[PDB]
C-alpha cells in the first residue's frame, strides 16, 4: 500500500493519473478493485487489462468461480486471488446503464469497497458501462467511508475530475 502522486479529493478518496495496472505492479496494494460484470468475463476496458497483467491467471479462476456460485447480481461483489497485482481482487459489478440498468445500483455498487480499509480502484460505470464519470466520481466520494485510491488512466478526464472537486 506505498501510494506516490496522488491528490487528496476529501477525507478518505485520492486520485492519480494512471494506468490501473501499473500502480498495481508499483504498490502490491492488499485490494485491487476490478470493474467487472455479472459473469467475471474479463474481454475490456479495465477488467481486460488487469486480466491481461495476470496472463489470463484472473480469467481462469473468474470462470471457476462462477461454475460453483452462478452469476453476481448488479451492485454486488466477490473477492478473488490478486495473483500478481495485489493480494486480493475485488470484482465489482456497477449498472451498464446504456443497456438501461438503474444508476441507483452504482451507489451499491461502491459500498462493496467499505468491507475493505484500503483499496486501489477505478472508477466504476465509467467506461463502457456508459455513466458520466464525474457522477461516478460524486457516487464514490458520498458512499465510500473507507480509503480509496483511485487511478484514472485518460488525462483529459482526469484534468476535468480535478478540476470539478
Ligand atoms: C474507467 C475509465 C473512465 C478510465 C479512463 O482512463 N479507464 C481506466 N482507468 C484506469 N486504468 C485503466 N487501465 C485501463 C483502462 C483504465
Known amino acids: ?70 452469476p453476481l447480481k448488479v451492485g454486488g461483489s466477490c473477492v478473488l486471488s490478486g495473483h500478481n497485482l ?14 438501461g440498468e438503474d444508476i441507483q445500483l452504482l451507489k451499491s455498487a461502491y459500498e462493496n469497497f467499505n468491507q475493505h480499509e484500503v483499496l486501489l480502484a477505478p472508477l466504476l460505470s465509467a467506461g463502457i458501462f456508459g455513466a458520466d464519470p464525474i457522477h461516478s466520481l460524486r457516487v464514490c466520494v458520498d458512499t465510500v467511508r473507507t480509503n480509496v485510491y483511485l487511478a484514472v488512466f485518460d488525462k483529459n478526464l482526469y484534468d476535468k475530475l480535478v478540476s470539478s472537486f
Open 86 to 99: 495485489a493480494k486480493h481482487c475485488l470484482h465489482v459489478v456497477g449498472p451498464n446503464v446504456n443497456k
Open 1 to 70: 500500500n506505498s501510494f506516490s502522486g496522488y491528490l487528496k479529493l476529501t477525507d478518505n478518496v485520492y486520485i492519480k493519473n494512471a494506468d490501473i495496472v501499473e500502480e498495481a505492479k508499483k504498490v502490491k496494494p492488499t485490494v485491487v478493485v476490478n470493474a467487472a460484470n455479472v459473469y467475471l468475463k474479463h474481454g475490456g476496458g479495465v477488467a481486460g487489462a488487469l486480466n491481461k497483467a495476470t496472463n489470463n491467471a484472473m480469467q481462469v479462476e473468474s470462470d471457476d468461480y462462477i461454475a460453483t456460485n452462478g
